[PDB]
Amino acid sequence: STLDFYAQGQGDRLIDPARFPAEIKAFLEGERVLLDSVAEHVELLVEVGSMHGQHLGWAIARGKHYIGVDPVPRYIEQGRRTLREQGLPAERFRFIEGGAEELHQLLPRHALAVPPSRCLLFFPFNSFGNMRDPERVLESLSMTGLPFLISSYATTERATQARAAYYAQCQYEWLESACDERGVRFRAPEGFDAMAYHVEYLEPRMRRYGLEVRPIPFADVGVAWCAGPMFE
Numbered sequence: 672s673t674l675d676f677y678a679q680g681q682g683d684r685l686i687d688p689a690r691f692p693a694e695i696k697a698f699l700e701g702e703r704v705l706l707d708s709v710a711e712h713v714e715l716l717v718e719v720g721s722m723h724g725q726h727l728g729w730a731i732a733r734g735k736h737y738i739g740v741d742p743v744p745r746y747i748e749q750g751r752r753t754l755r756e757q758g759l760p761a762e763r764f765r766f767i768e769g770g771a772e773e774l775h776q777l778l779p780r781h782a783l784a785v786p787p788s789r790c791l792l793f794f795p796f797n798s799f800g801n802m803r804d805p806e807r808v809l810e811s812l813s814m815t816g817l818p819f820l821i822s823s824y825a826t827t828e829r830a831t832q833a834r835a836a837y838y839a840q841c842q843y844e845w846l847e848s849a850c851d852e853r854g855v856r857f858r859a860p861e862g863f864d865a866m867a868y869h870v871e872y873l874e875p876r877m878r879r880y881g882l883e884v885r886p887i888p889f890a891d892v893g894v895a896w897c898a899g900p901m902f903e
């Protein structure tokens with residue numbers, strides 16, 4: 672999707688809970704169960720596509736270090752206002768205005784202060800599917816060498832119908848679904864462009880960049896692209 676899409680507020684509709692059908696609520700619950708299931712191996716959660724910080728509350732509750740990464744300034748400002756409000760220290764909870772494309776520049780080893788194995792680059796609610804160039808994101812991920820959890824969707828007709836039911840409740844000028852060699856693409860002329868990549872297309876792309884990924888299916892319509900020792 673476009674930066675303008677989110678900047679101008681159209682993108683806000685995608686985290687309005689009133690717009691979540693049952694299959695997507697189930698998806699978000701399943702997303703959290705996978706995160707919980709490796710929680711004991713996470714000291715630093717890096718939320719990639721964080722918005723205002725959807726999993727900040729998770730990190731606060733579980734006593735984890737937090738970095739929200741999002742290229743939308745108004746979302747970074749919202750997240751930072753939340754940290755100031757509760758008086759949370761910067762050395763534990765931060766926001767970084769940037770793209771997943773430059774993750775390797777945003778997260779140099781020294782800046783972590785946590786072993787690589789206890790870090791998780793968590794891309795929630797199909798943030799990865801809304802990124803301009805997935806090939807750039809995968810290379811950036813490769814160069815960080817950090818464990819990651821890319822939460823996205825399956826490309827079964829049922830998964831596509833779940834996404835259609837979710838996106839259509841945002842009431843954009845029009846909504847197009849297309850299936851091609853890469854995956855299932857939803858577009859709207861507001862600047863919405865959301866992909867779910869076929870398991871058969873993306874797994875080879877992952878391995879090409881040396882990422883030892885497993886596509887873990889969850890909550891009927893989800894697949895979690897999981898790499899790192901906590902997924903042994």
Ligand SMILES: Nc1ncnc2c1ncn2[C@@H]1O[C@H](CSCC[C@H](N)C(=O)O)[C@@H](O)[C@H]1O
Binds near residue numbers: 771798800866
């Ligand atoms: N290159 C990028 N790097 C990091 N975050 C990005 C990004 N491109 C978009 N995002 C952010 O990802 C967040 C969620 S987009 C997710 C859309 C929707 N939940 C879906 O199911 O497809 C937004 O805040 C957006 O600004």
